[PDB]
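Bench log. Compound arrived from synthesis this morning; before running ITC I wanted a structural hypothesis for how zinc ion sits in the protein. Inputs:
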Amino acid sequence: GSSGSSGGPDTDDPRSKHKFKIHTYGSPTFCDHCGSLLYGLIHQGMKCDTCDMNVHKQCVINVPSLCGMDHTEKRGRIYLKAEVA
Ligand SMILES: [Zn+2]
Ligand SMILES: [Zn+2]
């Protein structure tokens, strides 16, 4: 015997990563990182799916991967549109 000595897995944390998704807004929202009015017609900014944090497309890179904090009490609402053929 005396064989079989190894072990030590390691990897980044893909869970902490932000799930920001490029989406449009209907109201004048302000970034969460820098804090500046978010203008634009299509793909104005980005919004997470876990922390629903609105941030600029270029701000997402600056925002700290740190995602999943339970230190918030505010929660916005989502709207929907209709169509016809
Ligand atoms: Zn997030
Ligand atoms: Zn920003």
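What the model suggests: The two ends are 75 Å apart (CA to CA). Strands lie at 21-23, 45-47, 54-56.
ITC booked for Thursday regardless.
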